Amino acid sequence: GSMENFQKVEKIGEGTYGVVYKARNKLTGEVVALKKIRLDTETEGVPSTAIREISLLKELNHPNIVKLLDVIHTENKLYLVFEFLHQDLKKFMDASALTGIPLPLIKSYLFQLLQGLAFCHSHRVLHRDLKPQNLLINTEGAIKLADFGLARAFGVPVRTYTHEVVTLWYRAPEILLGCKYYSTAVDIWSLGCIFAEMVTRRALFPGDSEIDQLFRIFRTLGTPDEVVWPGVTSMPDYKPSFPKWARQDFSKVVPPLDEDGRSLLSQMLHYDPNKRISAKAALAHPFFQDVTKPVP
Amino acid sequence: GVNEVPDYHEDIHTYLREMEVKCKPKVGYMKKQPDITNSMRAILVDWLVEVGEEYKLQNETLHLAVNYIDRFLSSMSVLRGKLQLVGTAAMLLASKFEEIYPPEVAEFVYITDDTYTKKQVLRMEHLVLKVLAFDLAAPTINQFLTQYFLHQQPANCKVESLAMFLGELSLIDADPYLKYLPSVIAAAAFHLALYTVTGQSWPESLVQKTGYTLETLKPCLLDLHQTYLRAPQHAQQSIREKYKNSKYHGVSLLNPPETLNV
Ligand SMILES: NS(=O)(=O)c1ccc(I)cc1
Numbered sequence: 001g002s003m004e005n006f007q008k009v010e011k012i013g014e015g016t017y018g019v020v021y022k023a024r025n026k027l028t029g030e031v032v033a034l035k036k037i038r039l040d041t042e043t044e045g046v047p048s049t050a051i052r053e054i055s056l057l058k059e060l061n062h063p064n065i066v067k068l069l070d071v072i073h074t075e076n077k078l079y080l081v082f083e084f085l086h087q088d089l090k091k092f093m094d095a096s097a098l099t100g101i102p103l104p105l106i107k108s109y110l111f112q113l114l115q116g117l118a119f120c121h122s123h124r125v126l127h128r129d130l131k132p133q134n135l136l137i138n139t140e141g142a143i144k145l146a147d148f149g150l151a152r153a154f155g156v157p158v159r160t161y162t163h164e165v166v167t168l169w170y171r172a173p174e175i176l177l178g179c180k181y182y183s184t185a186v187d188i189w190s191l192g193c194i195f196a197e198m199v200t201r202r203a204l205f206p207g208d209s210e211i212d213q214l215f216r217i218f219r220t221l222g223t224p225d226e227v228v229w230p231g232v233t234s235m236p237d238y239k240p241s242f243p244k245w246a247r248q249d250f251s252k253v254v255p256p257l258d259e260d261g262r263s264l265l266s267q268m269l270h271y272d273p274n275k276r277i278s279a280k281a282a283l284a285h286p287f288f289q290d291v292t293k294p295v296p
Numbered sequence: 297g298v299n300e301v302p303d304y305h306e307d308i309h310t311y312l313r314e315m316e317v318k319c320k321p322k323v324g325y326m327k328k329q330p331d332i333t334n335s336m337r338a339i340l341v342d343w344l345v346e347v348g349e350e351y352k353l354q355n356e357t358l359h360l361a362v363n364y365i366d367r368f369l370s371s372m373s374v375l376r377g378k379l380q381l382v383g384t385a386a387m388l389l390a391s392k393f394e395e396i397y398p399p400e401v402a403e404f405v406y407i408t409d410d411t412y413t414k415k416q417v418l419r420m421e422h423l424v425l426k427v428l429a430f431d432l433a434a435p436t437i438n439q440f441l442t443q444y445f446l447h448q449q450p451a452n453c454k455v456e457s458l459a460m461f462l463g464e465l466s467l468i469d470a471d472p473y474l475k476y477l478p479s480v481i482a483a484a485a486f487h488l489a490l491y492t493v494t495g496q497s498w499p500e501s502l503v504q505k506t507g508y509t510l511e512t513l514k515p516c517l518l519d520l521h522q523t524y525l526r527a528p529q530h531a532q533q534s535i536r537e538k539y540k541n542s543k544y545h546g547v548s549l550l551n552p553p554e555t556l557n558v
């Protein structure tokens with residue numbers, strides 16, 4: 001396309017790979033977000049992270065995944081044209097800090113996140129960076145997965161992919177304990193952590209280091225064992241010294257949440273990757289039998 | 297096991313089958329290339345094999361590169377002295393897509409023996425991205441092979457290696473192999489590797505997965521059996537050398553069966 005039909009409106013964000021602007025198509029009226037990715041034309045070429053994001057988003061056409069609308073090329077820059085959405089879930093929860101977030105809106109948003117995610121998994125794409133700042137809402141009650149920067153197309157069965165993946169707080173315990181293979185579950189874990197956070201508006205496991213991240217999960221969910229999580233004690237970064245914490249009651253962890261909520265959450269936060277619910281399965285869960293789509 | 301994505305293996309398979317049709321190159325592109333030939337390409341692909349071993353790259357990366365090249369050359373006429381530039385750039389992109397720790401651009405300039413400048417490699421990178429329109433997530437022979445291995449009961453390392461090896465043999469020869477989809481080559485390769493080491497044949501469970509019977513795999517099976525048999529005498533050997541190693545259970549030193557008994 002052409003960068004002459006876009007009128008820049010403001011910088012809505014930035015990142016290691018460039019700045020994000022909000023823009024207006026002068027000819028159609030459409031409002032967009034422009035990701036400008038600088039090209040290292042003498043050194044490293046197009047960033048692997050952009051190559052993945054563009055390639056993958058080009059394949060993921062679903063109403064709960066952010067839409068890449070165009071990629072405009074120069075010799076020296078790449079501009080990604082995305083649909084503009086009003087804000088991210090992080091910003092929203094921080095502004096709903098006192099008013100609170102209505103339960104049917106939470107249920108809607110989770111339901112949509114799961115629909116979006118199930119599409120990724122159905123299309124052999126891991127996201128590996130689900131967290132509130134990467135989830136975009138609009139004014140009509142829609143939410144969408146965004147920032148496929150760290151995503152990866154996967155094979156069946158999975159192989160060793162980058163370990164340095166997922167913000168710590170949203171990082172599943174199989175990565176923490178340092179296993180070779182991870183899969184669709186790591187995404188579900190994150191959404192579990194997100195589910196909890198939508199309800200309490202506090203982060204569920206806000207750890208300041210790796211060992212700390214593990215302790216925070218174990219105090220809340222009970223230190224795993226071989227009867228909960230076969231294979232845990234033989235994990236690379238497992239340490240038999242870990243204190244033996246009694247599992248906390250989900251009605252302390254998420255007081256506002258109903259019995260069905262607590263069930264879905266627990267299945268999302270299962271220690272065992274193999275036993276953790278699928279996005280596909282979670283969509284059937286009885287928590288959603290009465291879902292609607294309210295506006296924020 | 298979630299590493300086999302139980303709730304998705306089917307949805308994924310269905311999708312790869314539909315996507316492999318869309319990433320498929322034009323079967324007779326070399327006829328329309330006025331200055332390059334199946335032999336020249338064979339040399340290129342064979343060299344990519346070497347590169348993959350020197351930099352210890354995933355086999356998936358090699359497969360992606362060859363996908364990139366064939367689609368590129370389905371759309372762009374290229375002179376012989378630029379064939380390698382196209383090759384290098386495709387390998388670079390494949391690596392950035394697929395590898396945890398891809399080699400730096402510098403390294404790719406190093407292996408063309410400074411045939412090209414770094415700047416040529418990077419500008420070719422951009423061109424290849426533009427030509428393919430960033431449709432890089434190509435289903436490969438390997439992506440089908442791994443999914444097929446799951447039907448083994450139990451798994452046999454020698455079957456896995458031999459099928460991988462037979463898959464890579466196909467990369468080299470656009471004639472005939474450009475006329476088979478990946479999932480077809482992959483099946484033929486798996487049937488042929490399994491038949492060789494065990495005596496068994498295409499599982500009925502894979503028939504039920506793929507819709508591919510032996511009847512449907514026969515044309516491909518015939519071509520591939522012939523490749524396997526003539527393999528020691530091929531002009532390109534890098535793949536045979538690669539699969540002599542203990543890494544791949546030395547399946548290339550295994551003597552091929554003489555008939556496939558229909
Ligand atoms: N990170 S991204 O490019 O997916 C994106 C960020 C913000 C908006 I609004 C739309 C897209």
Ligand SMILES: NS(=O)(=O)c1ccc(I)cc1
Nearest residue numbers: 068069070071426429430
């Ligand atoms: N790279 S490109 O210009 O071929 C392209 C076009 C449209 C989309 I959506 C993504 C990429």
